[PDB]
Symmetry: T
Subunit: 162 residues, 12 copies
Amino acid sequence: GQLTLTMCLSGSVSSVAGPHMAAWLSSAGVGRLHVALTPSAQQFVTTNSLRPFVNGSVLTDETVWSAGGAPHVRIAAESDAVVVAPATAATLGKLANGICDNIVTQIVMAAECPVILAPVMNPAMLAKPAVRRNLDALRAEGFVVAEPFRSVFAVALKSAAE
Amino acid sequence: GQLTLTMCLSGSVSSVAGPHMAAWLSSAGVGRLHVALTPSAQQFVTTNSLRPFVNGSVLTDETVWSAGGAPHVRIAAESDAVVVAPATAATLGKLANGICDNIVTQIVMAAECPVILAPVMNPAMLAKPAVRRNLDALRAEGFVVAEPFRSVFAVALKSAAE
Amino acid sequence: GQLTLTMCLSGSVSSVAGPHMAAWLSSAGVGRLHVALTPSAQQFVTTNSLRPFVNGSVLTDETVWSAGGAPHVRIAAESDAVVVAPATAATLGKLANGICDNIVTQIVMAAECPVILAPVMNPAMLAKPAVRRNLDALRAEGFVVAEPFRSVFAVALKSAAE
Amino acid sequence: GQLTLTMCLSGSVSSVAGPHMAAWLSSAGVGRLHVALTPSAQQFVTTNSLRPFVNGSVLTDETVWSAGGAPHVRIAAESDAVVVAPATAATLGKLANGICDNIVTQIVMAAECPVILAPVMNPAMLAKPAVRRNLDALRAEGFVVAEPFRSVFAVALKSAAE
Amino acid sequence: GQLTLTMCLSGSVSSVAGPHMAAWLSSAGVGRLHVALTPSAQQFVTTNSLRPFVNGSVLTDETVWSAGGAPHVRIAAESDAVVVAPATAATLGKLANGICDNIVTQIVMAAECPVILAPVMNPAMLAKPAVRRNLDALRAEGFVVAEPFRSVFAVALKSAAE
Amino acid sequence: GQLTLTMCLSGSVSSVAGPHMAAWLSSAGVGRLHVALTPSAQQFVTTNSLRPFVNGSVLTDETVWSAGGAPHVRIAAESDAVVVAPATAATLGKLANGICDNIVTQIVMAAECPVILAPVMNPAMLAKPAVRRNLDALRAEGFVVAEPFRSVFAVALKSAAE
Amino acid sequence: GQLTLTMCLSGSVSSVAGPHMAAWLSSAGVGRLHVALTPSAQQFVTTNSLRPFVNGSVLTDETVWSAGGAPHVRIAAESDAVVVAPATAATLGKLANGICDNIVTQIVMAAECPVILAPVMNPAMLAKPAVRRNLDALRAEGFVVAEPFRSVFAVALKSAAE
Amino acid sequence: GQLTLTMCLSGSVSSVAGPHMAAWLSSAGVGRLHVALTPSAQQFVTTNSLRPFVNGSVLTDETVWSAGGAPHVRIAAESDAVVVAPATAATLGKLANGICDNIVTQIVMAAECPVILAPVMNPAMLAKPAVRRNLDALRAEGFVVAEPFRSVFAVALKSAAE
Amino acid sequence: GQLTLTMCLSGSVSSVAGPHMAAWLSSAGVGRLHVALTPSAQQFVTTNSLRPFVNGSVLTDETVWSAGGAPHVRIAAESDAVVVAPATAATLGKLANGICDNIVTQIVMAAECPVILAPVMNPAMLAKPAVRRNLDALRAEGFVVAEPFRSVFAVALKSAAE
Amino acid sequence: GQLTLTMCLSGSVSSVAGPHMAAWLSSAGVGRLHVALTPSAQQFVTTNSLRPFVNGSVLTDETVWSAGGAPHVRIAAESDAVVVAPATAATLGKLANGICDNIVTQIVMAAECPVILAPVMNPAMLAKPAVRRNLDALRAEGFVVAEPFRSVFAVALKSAAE
Amino acid sequence: GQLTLTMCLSGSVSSVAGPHMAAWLSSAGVGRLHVALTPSAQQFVTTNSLRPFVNGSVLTDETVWSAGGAPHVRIAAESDAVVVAPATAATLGKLANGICDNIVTQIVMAAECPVILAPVMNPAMLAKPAVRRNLDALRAEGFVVAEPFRSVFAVALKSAAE
Amino acid sequence: GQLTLTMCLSGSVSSVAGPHMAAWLSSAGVGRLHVALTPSAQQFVTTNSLRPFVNGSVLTDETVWSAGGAPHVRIAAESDAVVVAPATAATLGKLANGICDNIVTQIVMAAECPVILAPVMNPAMLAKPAVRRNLDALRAEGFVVAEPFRSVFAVALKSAAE
Ligand SMILES: Cc1cc2nc3c(=O)[nH]c(=O)nc-3n(C[C@H](O)[C@H](O)[C@H](O)COP(=O)(O)O)c2cc1C
Ligand SMILES: Cc1cc2nc3c(=O)[nH]c(=O)nc-3n(C[C@H](O)[C@H](O)[C@H](O)COP(=O)(O)O)c2cc1C
Ligand SMILES: Cc1cc2nc3c(=O)[nH]c(=O)nc-3n(C[C@H](O)[C@H](O)[C@H](O)COP(=O)(O)O)c2cc1C
């Protein structure tokens, strides 16, 4: 009802569910919804597919660049929860190592609200030691790592209540 | 099992469900799946979001132009059913009046298999006389008009059996 | 005074009068004025020539695409009258057959307010049977067809009162 | 001898015969020959392949746009016959419904001379009800529909005599 | 009747009246009409909106560059009057100081016929000392400055008689 | 506190101080701050370097063109002082001669508030007669010429009080 | 029946007959047909006009570049005859002097099968000494020079039998 | 003989040896050879220099993007060994930290076969602590790190046997 | 007086004299003057530098391509003399071997009037055997080779008299 | 011998003599020669036509922009004379009014050496009052105005001696 | 005096101080100054704003790419100190993990001189565990981390003395 | 030791050995090394792969064009030997016939030092009469033709000694 939730989409084909998830959130209590995309995510989701379901901003690296300022960092501050779903190995690896080189990773690293991450990758990657350690680091950040999607957004909304 | 189905996507935001529908069809009996997009549909679905679920071709006007030939018309001939879902007012209006100016409308007008159409538009358009008459014309073509999505593909698969 | 009027411009050289008409409307009672252009209309009118006289939006297909959403359909809903003046043979033919492939035709087909159309073409086209039938269809839509420009906007403003 | 004939080419591969037909006409009595192409026709014929055989204009949508004015409509007025050969389903459908959205359809709808049309399409389209009705409409226009190419231009030249 | 008049358009929104003025002149005695545009004027008028009313040339900086030669200077020589209407502060300032950096200013400075100028600007500029002095300089050139549009073209046509 | 100040930046390397000056003004009483750039100034300052310190608009010629309207002239009207700092020889020369060919010069010539100018150039230019006369003209305009930067903005803020 | 024939097209307007010739060959015994174009030939023939009649490859310099490898040289090796028809003066001159700077000349110089060449040029070139000598050189290569088109392809098919 | 080997090339000038190495492998027992390039590697090797020696795919980020799907991940699965040679500091650092942001790093992190890495960098980097730790991490992945090129491919082929 | 002369310019820096030579010819008896440029010549001469002195056509490869037809070959036929001055080694080599791959070489090889050539190159090229033989071939063509510029055009004008 | 001379070229067709003049200067005593072009001058002279005769820099606005710094102002300081020949009305007007908006005008206004200007324009401009006054202003600058080209460079070289 | 210092600028708005800092260094003892920018830094600083104060090179990724070679690595070797100020979270994270994917990170990782880093970020990032660990890693590299700008360059100059 | 050698690379895949050969030469006595590429060679070698091994210039047609002047001809003059290795059929054919249309062929034809050529082509071309004659012509030029690569550069270095 009174919640501002920011949804982040990574370069996984699962992010085609973005518009469906945004509608699920919109067609429920969520007051403000924001969506941010990594560059790779834009090969699987278009911003025009998200805008009809998103009463906040739909942010890409190009959108934020041409607008100037740091509107994404304002949105991080204004969020009661930030969800990265799907979260690719690459995005998890960047967050785990503090390398915020796009708008999605900058939003997460600027956020002080609960952060829920939903890793998605082939299990030929999810058991690799380097990925295990990244999940360890992400969890030391205080982030919630939901291994292995409506269940994910339920946990985010609960955390956003407090 | 032994069926070749071609799915067509129109410039409605509902066509973001394309990849989910293609996976539903793929994760079932369908043997060959093809997908064709109108130019306007590409603002809502990317071809890269469809390709992982489509063991046939993913066709756009640009894809077919640069390849040369009429591969879409070969695919129409090889199809046991053609589904347009969603079908915009514009696409319904073009088919209803024999104006096949893109690959999607050319596939439908070349097809001799069952054709199932799923109109999607605001009801401020669906009760307009011109749209009613277009649906009359589409139905005189022998096309199945499913007013007002898994139910739609079920009817297509039944017709494709005979 | 309390009226929202949307003016649509077609690919006829007569649409160079757009800015003059918008000023006439603005320099009178009209409360909100919107203007939409077909792609062909943009070879005869620039958006920058309209903006100084238009306190609402000036919409083209490119403007609406990059903005995302359906702001033109919101504007159709918010309009007390929609005027297409000039209305080319091509635009009349598309409306008459329910083929809304640009923002102007989508606005008209989404509108539930009075719609006034001002055909403009060489009389070598206006007596062609196909054009006569299109005008028949447009008039069955409930649209007001003003054969053969201030008089046109007067009729629109009267209808918008009720 | 004293005749001005305008030849129109549609997006069918048969329009590669354009240059051969223009030479046949040129290498005979025809006094002025003009040629107009639809955008789709330009994937099958180049203007440079036509110009050596055409003592009038070779018109495309881009040619006419950059030149300004309506030189194609002047050419329609100056023609003693207009031939569309090949005429695609799409072009026939547009003419049949009064939607002149390119230079070829504008020339036909502006012409007051005899108009001869040569449909070309797969018979999976030519027996479709919507195409049958379009041919009915084209023939109510007074156009000569030559179902199912030198024979076509012979009929055009006879009509141009009166 | 026997007069050649060149009309120049500046980067003021008033130059949208260009096509209407050209038709007024054309729909009267004027024998040859030419039109030239500054680059800024092209954000308010298109050349395609002028060409149907202009039996001479419609000149822009790009048109003249790609054509080569100085066709605009030939047109200045062939003119019985040159009208700049509207004349922006910038164009007045350039003429007043002999800086002909575009085709419009080159036409005026090459002309030996009567030159009529119609300043248009917000009165926050027209009382500025620098603009007053520019008008002084323009008038020392022998130009007719019509402070503060059919009346303007009437004065030009009278001067062109002698 | 209650002041609207517009800062203009010219094509001098000194305009890299723009962001620092905007922060100095912002980190003080100034209520609304606007910034406008000449095209040459954009080789030394980016708009993204200014936006974080500017609670009004950051205007370039391209920004204003694509937005349509004259938002810069609205901003001139709404300003209690306009500062050009640095002011190049070229910009001083244009203002001095009433040639407002970009957004910065248009803002100054439209402004009725105090105008403070800070010339910056090599003294091989500042003693040239033509530049001396331009400063004479600028000062006859009522502009404050601060020969030969915080001191400049102090004078502007004092004048803006009345 | 069992023959692989490669047809090469040069920058002569006669190469518009390419699609007609390819259909003649296809609508006969020829088993594999390949077509290669010089860059200049592409101003007279499009690849999309050839592809429907060509069951092998349609090769241009750009096609081969982006594909990588030397697929044209594989096709030369696999050919039972190579026909250049029309063969321009420029292409004849390059072959005659061993300068294979495009895909067409590389195919001929790599071919070990019979090579049939059909010169086409104005007789103001065909009697020039330099062209006579080039034909001498081409014929010393073992190539068949058919001075001065179905007859040409008949000779090629006979040679391909042995 | 029966082995599928994938060779990866990084942005080191040493990757100009790629084509020579691919020929060495091809001119030996290797059955299927694939090559993948990082974006930086393409300033030192062209894909056209590799294709003649590579009977599998030559993959770049652009190649895979436009093709859609994950053909590189299929190739990782089908490989009996993956060699990165040369492996830059940047590529080693990305693999070491699970950041697969290009096709080369995605292939390695998806591979379940032996992975052999050949670091190449100035020793001013190879003794840096951060690089030492990356090599530690790479070796904990089970990768073979060949400090400090035919010897490297020999070790890969031995591992691929089992 | 009654002569049509075509001047050709090659990629030598000496062709900057083109405009001066065209004026010399124009400021004398020459009735029609045409100028053609090789692509390399356009790095040393612009067409806009020639047009003011040339009452015929100024032809480049791009000019002729976009115009369609063979206007250069018409100009060759209409010429009483063709001069190539300067003539580079490359252009001499192409003519000598019948390789007319640009508009300049096509004009010469189509011309039946006297042809005068003025070689210009470093003497490190003019004594090379291959260049000597090319001059032998050019002279067997009947061309006049003026080893080693007003004197050259005098010889051309004398030959053009007969 | 020991002199550094900078030659400036304006947008007059006379600047095609630039390369000839630079060679005349080079083929004499001049030690360092620099050349600068206005943007309009580049439609009549190419930089590649000047470079072979210029042992200093050949400067355009684009050259200086991409290089950064003010190399043209360094060259002004290092010059013993600066010649503008031809000097257009526009360039004279800019210098006369202190508006150095390109590299050529910046060089002149930065120069402390003798400056020689050679006006070139149609006498329909040279007797205009505004141009007369500009020449008055140029001469008050201390510049030498050579009304109405080797004679011009002789005067410059004499002044450069002192 | 005898020192070569390389200054690196990251994608923080603080890097607009780059030109001011370079002038401070230049207007002091520093003998050679170099500046390198990350791609993101170029949205806040232009190279043209730095060049006037930098007697060495101003390096970007594009500059180094087009020049070829590794001039940045030569500059790293020639430096007595390298300062990254501001250093973003992203750049710190890359250095901390040995991922030198741009010219700035390559310069630091190649440098054997003292390296001083000035982190700049919102404290919502500087207390994140992943950033703390990166600073730990940077400091294990021997780098000087100046938490939380003239003071920073003072420490760099002291270290460069030894 | 004291030798300047220029290496030329043709459009053969063998030119990928360019960087290895340049290093072999550099890692030996050669004092100055230059490298020039044909346009086709750039699909197989990048300039950035050569620059690290080349202490002279790496020249392409685009490099030389944008630089102006004839730096390649200066390099030809300064060379003690010029090697073309590999030399394609096309490049051999051009040299053999004096057609220097790119920088590589211009360097060879300008060179007065020993010239060593290493033909590389499929033997389906090397026994063609036209290629045999080209080798005859190349050898009459005094060039050394090394039929059928370190051995080639050894012969060049021996000749360069005298
Ligand atoms: C956000 C958005 C949603 C739209 N949804 C629909 C829709 O659901 N049904 C429809 O007929 N048109 C819809 N339109 C309008 C169509 O996109 C438009 O008519 C288009 O030209 C259809 O093109 P196509 O039928 O060739 O795909 C929508 C437009 C926008 C901007
Ligand atoms: C073919 C041609 C020749 C011209 N010749 C002159 C000339 O001789 N003198 C002049 O003042 N302007 C001449 N002009 C107009 C100038 O090019 C125009 O004023 C231009 O903007 C000058 O720019 P610049 O002074 O910055 O070089 C000519 C224009 C054209 C198209
Ligand atoms: C993959 C490939 C390899 C080639 N190898 C050769 C070759 O080894 N020798 C040759 O003469 N031509 C070869 N060619 C053809 C040449 O690239 C072609 O003739 C080109 O225009 C030569 O240009 P250049 O001599 O100006 O560099 C090859 C072409 C391709 C696509």
